[PDB]
Amino acid sequence: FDLPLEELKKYRPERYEEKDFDEFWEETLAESEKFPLDPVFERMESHLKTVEAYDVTFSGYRGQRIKGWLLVPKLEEEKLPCVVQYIGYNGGRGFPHDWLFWPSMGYICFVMDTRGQGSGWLKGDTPDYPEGPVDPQYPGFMTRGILDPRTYYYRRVFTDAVRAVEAAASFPQVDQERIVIAGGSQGGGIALAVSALSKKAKALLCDVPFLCHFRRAVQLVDTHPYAEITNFLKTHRDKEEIVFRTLSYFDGVNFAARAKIPALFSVGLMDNICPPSTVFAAYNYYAGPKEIRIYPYNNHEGGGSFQAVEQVKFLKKLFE
């Protein structure tokens, strides 16, 4: 349904960002750095036997305390590599045993809970906090605070996510040379923002990323969650320029252009949640060394368990 693959490979649409994109993010991170990280780990009583699980609490946007899990595989090596895992839309940190893959492959896993979500497919424990008034919005998180980038929901999520990497680095068994940031869909868009904003991330795993090339996305598909934006615009006919102006500060295509760390991307060519031209726009602008795995017959599931193995191989080669 989207551009054919040879056009996708060369798709580099003109980028739109405001003159103060960097300043906005510098100011944001500076203000939140004024609050101590105060990363706290508490070993959980758990039935898990191959992994130690810890409850995590750390300061994200404006000192707000974000939950996480830290999963440490019970192995002989002193320092371990670490994957910081961001969660898809309407998910949350769930139970420790929901996140066994990376530890089973020998990596400490830091799972960041997602402020205010945690109610669609996997439970969460972290609340959101708005700046002040909660403006008229369409149901969901995509239009929460959308009339100003200072009030926009993903400002708070992305800052949480940058601080999560510092929180992971605070665990002494983490090898700070081998901290990976990872996610799919919303998780992928979060990780992409982190890949540009974090000083500590060493590699990026970015699967079927959401939060990319918003203007084209709402023109291309009527699926959720991009359709929250479209539905808002159907009602607020006077706010089109403001909406896209705000979203430009959160668009993965704009972060991709600033990111320098090694990355592995994936894309499903039949994905109508995260359309491939949106994924390719981010991938093609990504400034660091990069590869993409292309799944021509998959929808939003992308490469699934095949991709998981591709990721393990990729990291092993990068870090060897």
Add this chain to the structure above:
Amino acid sequence: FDLPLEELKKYRPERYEEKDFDEFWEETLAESEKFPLDPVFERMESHLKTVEAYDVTFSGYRGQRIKGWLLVPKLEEEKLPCVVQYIGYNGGRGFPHDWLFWPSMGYICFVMDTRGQGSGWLKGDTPDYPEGPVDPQYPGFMTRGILDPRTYYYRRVFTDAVRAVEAAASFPQVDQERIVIAGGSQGGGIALAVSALSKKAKALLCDVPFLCHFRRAVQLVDTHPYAEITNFLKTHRDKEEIVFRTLSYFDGVNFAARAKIPALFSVGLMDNICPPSTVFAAYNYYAGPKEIRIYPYNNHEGGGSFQAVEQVKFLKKLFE
């Protein structure tokens, strides 16, 4: 799809409420009465010629400044009857010309904007404000703060709605003894809550009401917006009792049992958004003088323009 009509007419299921229902609402309304109402009626340069439109501002929940419209028909009479109109889900106050029916029929119409909504089918101008943290929730308003009646979104809306009647009553041309409260679906549910809580309303028009008999609604239909609650429960599997206990404080059936003013209801027997058993449970417990118009072949549109005529006729006979 629901109970047959002769069973609907006798459907009076056992009500569930906590022992402190009245105290919860007494304390809520008392706390908000501590801020001055400070009703503002600012004439709006509209192009309307048979109606004068005012931009309304008034203090609702905890002093928070709620928007609205006041439309005054251009008539001889010094004291006119008034309809206070509440709005369907995802709507808001829109334009003054969206609410011409009651003014055209000789009634001043006070349209209350809906905090935080106004983004699905008609725009709105009024923000929400959470108590404190914004808990994990499913997209929308149904599960916003659902873990405690003190934090629940409809606490705020219903309080606004009570205060709206006091605001309308402040308008010098409003006849204090002919103030009607009206709404369809969400609007119906809000009006029902107000019919129990306000002491200033003379009559209720309650069309295809939402926010009624939650426990049963989520068993009967998988439509939105009831499905928000179901979807929250699908994830937060431990929270059934808490969710239903919170919702008991906001259930139209429990307000209906308290309401003493004359009411005209309407119901569509094929409505799968507000299922007939939910509307009938409310109607059957409604403690004031009452009638219901039954539309057996209509879905959620109910009686539409026919029902509007029934309303005008009902109010005319009542006020004689």
Add this chain to the structure above:
Amino acid sequence: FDLPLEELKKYRPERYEEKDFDEFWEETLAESEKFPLDPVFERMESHLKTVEAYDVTFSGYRGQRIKGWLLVPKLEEEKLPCVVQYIGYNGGRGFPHDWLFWPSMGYICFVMDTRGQGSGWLKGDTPDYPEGPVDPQYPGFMTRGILDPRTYYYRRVFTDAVRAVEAAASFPQVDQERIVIAGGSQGGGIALAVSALSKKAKALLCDVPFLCHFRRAVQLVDTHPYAEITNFLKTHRDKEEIVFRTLSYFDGVNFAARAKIPALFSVGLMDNICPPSTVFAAYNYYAGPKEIRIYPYNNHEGGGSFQAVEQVKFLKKLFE
């Protein structure tokens, strides 16, 4: 889904019409003009207080008696501007209170009932009369009489609509310098025909118009009502040429080319009932002074209440 906007703005495709288009309409109108118009305005008992309502009857196609409403706002004006309102597919004149907008804005409103429809979303009271046998057709109006323009349903509707403006001009309070023809969807298609054929209309309001560019419409979308045509062709496989020949006499694109009066159009770029390339073919051929309001994120709702405000402003400027 249709042509991108830069292409829609330049889209002026080869028109298809028979050499005898004008003759066909000259003869149609002359033939119906032999019967006296005989417009009848019966003041009605009404609950309405700001408006006087009349039950209308007038002679349309071949003297057949068409129903309407006349809504006159109660203002201190010896003459008032007038909107002649045409109605969407499957609608009818409903109740007087269904048409309050234009009276509220200070316009006498003549609502034309639609022959034979009035059964889908708002009731009507006027029958159709065929031009002899009622040929095999697909359910609906789009294919009724389609094998010959002389028998086609829209020949009668459009005649009626032209005659409606003459009937409005016959009410003494109407300001014949300020007669507007308006409609959305089917309404807009009717209004486009009237804009070419009427000697009385002074401005056109044409929203999301239907009955435009039929040949392209059926190639682009499978929605109703355009799909009635496609479904008829799926069965009458021998009638492609005849069907498109008939429809060319009723196509808004060919009327647009003949229209001289000022117009305000609207279009939704996500409209899949009236595709944007069909609306733009009509608009780009429209030969009078014109403007278009473009709603990029809206579907068939177009600009809704925002567009209603644009219309009032447009007409005040035009007529000032």
Add this chain to the structure above:
Amino acid sequence: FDLPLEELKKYRPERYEEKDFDEFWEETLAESEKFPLDPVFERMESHLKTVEAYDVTFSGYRGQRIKGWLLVPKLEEEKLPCVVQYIGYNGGRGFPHDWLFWPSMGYICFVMDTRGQGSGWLKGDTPDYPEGPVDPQYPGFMTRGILDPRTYYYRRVFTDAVRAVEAAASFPQVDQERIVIAGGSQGGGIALAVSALSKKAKALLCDVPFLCHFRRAVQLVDTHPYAEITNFLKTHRDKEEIVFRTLSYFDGVNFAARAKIPALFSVGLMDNICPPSTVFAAYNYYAGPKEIRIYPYNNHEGGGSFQAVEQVKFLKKLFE
């Protein structure tokens, strides 16, 4: 989805008809008998080799001229049994080769074309003619003239169908002792009316019959074509009694109670077009010697080709 089979077999609901049902039909048929039948059989040039095909014209309702086919198998017998075949909704007489079953089984087949349809799945050639004005209606045939039994579409169809049997009987090779009336769905409904009204039919084949038990059909399913009725009622909310009064004169259940000839019925227990309770109401009231083939897993296809073999066996046995 409907009553279980054990209850369907005992399902004999309270009937509803007007006291003048028989008078209405007697007057109807007497008036149309005043026009000469003048059955015209024109032998066609055909590629068919086992069958002789004739183009039929005969006088139906009020002398109106109805098309048909007559298919005569090339056999030694001088007199042959005859099946008069009525056609499903939106179909028409199509081509001679569409109707080969019965002639291949050694039956002359008279295929009656259906006035005004013929545009959905098989073409037709016969126009409808209204009783003057064609009232406001929902698209299709179900609500055409529904406000008065004298104007209702199926008054003209059922009269045509009775006259079709008279026309078939007129062909010299037909054995008037072995005239069968047959149809499925709309065809079955028509054939049921004809089993009560024709003095010439000798056996009925009635598959998955439509036009039965209208009041219950519209409560049970939202499929077309019954939904044409529900949709008209959703708009004409003041016409519920009148609509069902009109429909009582055309209801297969009411004809079944009057029919004397032997019949074979079929029913699909998962048929949501003609729900099983509607079909059983008709079968249970049928007053001639009868049998029903019950297909528990089939939808509206019923028994398909299996039922065709049942019919052949049933007729062989009956005709001795």
Add this chain to the structure above:
Amino acid sequence: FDLPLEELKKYRPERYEEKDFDEFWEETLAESEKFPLDPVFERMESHLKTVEAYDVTFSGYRGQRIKGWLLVPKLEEEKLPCVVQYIGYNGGRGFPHDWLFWPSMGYICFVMDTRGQGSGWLKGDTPDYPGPVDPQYPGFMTRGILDPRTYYYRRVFTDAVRAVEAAASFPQVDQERIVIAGGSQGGGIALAVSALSKKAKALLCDVPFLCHFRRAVQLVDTHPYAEITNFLKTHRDKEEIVFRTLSYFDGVNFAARAKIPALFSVGLMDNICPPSTVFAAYNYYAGPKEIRIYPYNNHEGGGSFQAVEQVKFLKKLFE
């Protein structure tokens, strides 16, 4: 939704087939020819009066016994033309009275039952016979797809070639007027037969399935082509193997080889058999040919209108 008609009429995509396409089919057919055909025509007791019905059995793939019907119109001419009819997906031979058209128009009709199907819209009586039946998506499109030797349509298409030999064995059949016909799956089968059989005299190919698989699975998500897509969604490592297998069964590759006169039909709104897949086959078809294009029809194609076009085409051809 597909290429516009002007483009479809000259759509001639580069073909993909293995070097051994012909050898594969030659070996396949020679191995099945080592088993005797043994056509069996059992005259049936029937309620049909204008035709004589026979219960057919013959040997298709590797001597496996395939069911069918033979319908013989009762006519004074001793040698009659014959149509060998293939059946659409999820159908089977049904009852003899399901197939009255061609006999009513004076043609003997040999109806080939379809191995292992017969359970969606019309019943069938003939089993499939595979060794191991590999992991597959529900249905027939992916059965044995990892090797052309094990692929389901190897067996169907062999059956279908053998069916023409079985029809020709019937003594009233005029061997100079044997037609092969079908729609959708039937048309894809008939298209393979048009290349592989030395006995067919003409081809009726409506709305053909089993054509241009690579494009088909990119263009539509309908069944049955979506069985292949779904298999590929799970077996991510088998993309090249899957399309290599399918190339041996692709109508476009058969059409390039076929020589007999043919009448095609296509629906421009068909989303089961997309018009570009039909036109790729039609444009490569190497025999004298015509196509009836129905711009507004979906997969129903020309329906009863096309049936008339078929009878006329054959009349003119055989006269």
Add this chain to the structure above:
Amino acid sequence: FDLPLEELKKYRPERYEEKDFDEFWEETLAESEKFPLDPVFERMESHLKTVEAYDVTFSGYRGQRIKGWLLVPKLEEEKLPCVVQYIGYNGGRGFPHDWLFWPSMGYICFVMDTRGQGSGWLKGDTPDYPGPVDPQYPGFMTRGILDPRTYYYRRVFTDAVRAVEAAASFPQVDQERIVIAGGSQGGGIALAVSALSKKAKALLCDVPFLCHFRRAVQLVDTHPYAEITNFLKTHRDKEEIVFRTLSYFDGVNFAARAKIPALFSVGLMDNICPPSTVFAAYNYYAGPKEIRIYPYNNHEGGGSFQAVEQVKFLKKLFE
């Protein structure tokens, strides 16, 4: 959409089985046990670090070689408890890393691949082996349905009995602490195994499929039960035969025979495995039993919540 919970709890519909149910299964198992089990566990090179992964092969129905995974958590304890895991419809054994839950909780996990499937949501490696494959609707539900001896699930349930024997043969498995587990199709398989094998100590049965077929096909039109209804729509003469065959594979009939402690789960909004079908099996289950009821869940059931319940249930059992 199904019976209200109060009635589901009381739903004990009359069971239907043939008088030779036990004899059929005795003969089936005895016939397959005449072939050597021959379990092979080949240690693999893997990226996993906390677990040892083995490629498994063993002899299921009639000596047919079935694939599997064996995942061993790297722990001090020498003889570990073991969960034998059966897979959902259209899945297969996938990758070793697809099954980390039980090993991470301290259980060796034996994952049985499902013959012939492995192509819808997770890949598989094991073929089916039928002679003739009768007319069927696409999928596995109607494959060989005209005779219980030829029916697809005769082969799967035998494989699944055999899997337990194969798990028991691995040296690190505590042969006295083996659990059987599955969801949906996996739950139906495990329910059969709870009746047919005496090796297992407990049953984990989530959202079970293959239960109360006669009712299932009347209540829902979803797949995979609809495969049965669709076959019946066409094979109108085979209704009695179809339901006779299915009675030999109905979880309600196996439940009545099972004795081991069981933990069930049900979603009251599940329209794939309707609550009445699940309660009919649960209500007849003869052993010590409990059911976790998820009133707002569809076919996902309890998801990770239910997994926690499972770990607690097994901990209590094995203390």
